A paper describes a structure:
Dvl is a pivotal factor in Wnt signal transduction, relaying Wnt signals to canonical and non-canonical downstream effectors. It contains three domains (separated by long flexible linkers) through which it binds to its signalling partners, typically with weak affinity. These weak interactions depend on dynamic and concentration-dependent polymerization by the DIX domain5, which transiently generates high local concentrations of binding sites.
Like other DIX domains5, the hDvl2 DIX monomer exhibits a ubiquitin-like fold, with five β-strands and an α-helix. Its structure is very similar to that of the Dvl1 DIX monomer11 (with a root-mean-square deviation (r.m.s.d). for the core Cα backbone of 1.14 Å between hDvl2 MolA and Dvl1 MolF), whereby the main differences are in two loop regions (between β1 and β2, and α1 and β3). There are marked differences in the dimensions of the DIX filament structures in the crystals: the filament of hDvl2 DIX is ∼67 Å wide, and its repeat length is 85 Å, with 6 monomers per turn, almost identical to the Axin DIX filament, whereas the filament in the Dvl1 DIX domain crystal (from the equivalent mutant, Y17D) is nearly twice as long as the Axin DIX filament, with a repeat length of ∼140 Å and 8 monomers per turn.
Numbering used by the authors:
A (entry chain A), B (entry chain B): 11 to 91
C (entry chain C): 12 to 92
Write the structure that this text describes.
């Protein structure tokens, strides 16, 4: 029980939408995010993430089972159509 | 089989995208990377490379057959135009 | 023959490595400039050895001047305006 704030940009848009998804941050998946958008497949989804060796990246994630990178209840995403 | 993480910057952008390509790091080529992106009107590709005498450098690579410099399953690239 | 020129642009931490198809025995500042298509009014410094002092970054502005090489390599720092 809990919610996650997903902040997402659609293509070249300057200002993202913020949506609250009623899945707690500890377990929110790409599948959870997709259910809320229902985007024509096949958008590609990138998320603000940390790479062990490199530092901050926009990580592409296409596996519905994959957990999304969160910080303080928040996910930050970029969509490409 | 195996995968490589390719971290790449597009022109003057601060934060790179990270994409996983399902070719193992021992054998990933420029051609492999290009097939996932699809090149502009001749983008130039630079990769974090190691010079035997100097240390870390950005090497331009334009040969599709050329293997990309990896460290720990990762390639780091900069793209121009 | 060819020379590997490793060069930094202003305060950039990682240099580009470019291969110039002039052998190291005769590569000049003019040769290097013709490949950059001189950003223009830039000053060029090269890792060099001074007889009395030791290692320095020697400014060179004469196109005819031969560049300091070690093992097929030149290391340069560029300053623009």
């Amino acid at each position: 029980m809990g919610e996650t704030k997903v902040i997402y940009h659609l293509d070249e848009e300057e200002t993202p939408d913020l949506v609250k998804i009623p899945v707690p941050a500890e377990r929110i998946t790409l599948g959870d995010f997709k259910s809320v958008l229902q985007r024509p497949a096949g958008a590609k989804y990138f998320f603000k993430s940390m790479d062990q060796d490199f530092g901050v990246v926009k990580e592409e994630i296409s596996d519905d089972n994959a957990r999304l990178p969160c910080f303080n209840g928040r996910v930050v995403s970029w969509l490409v159509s």
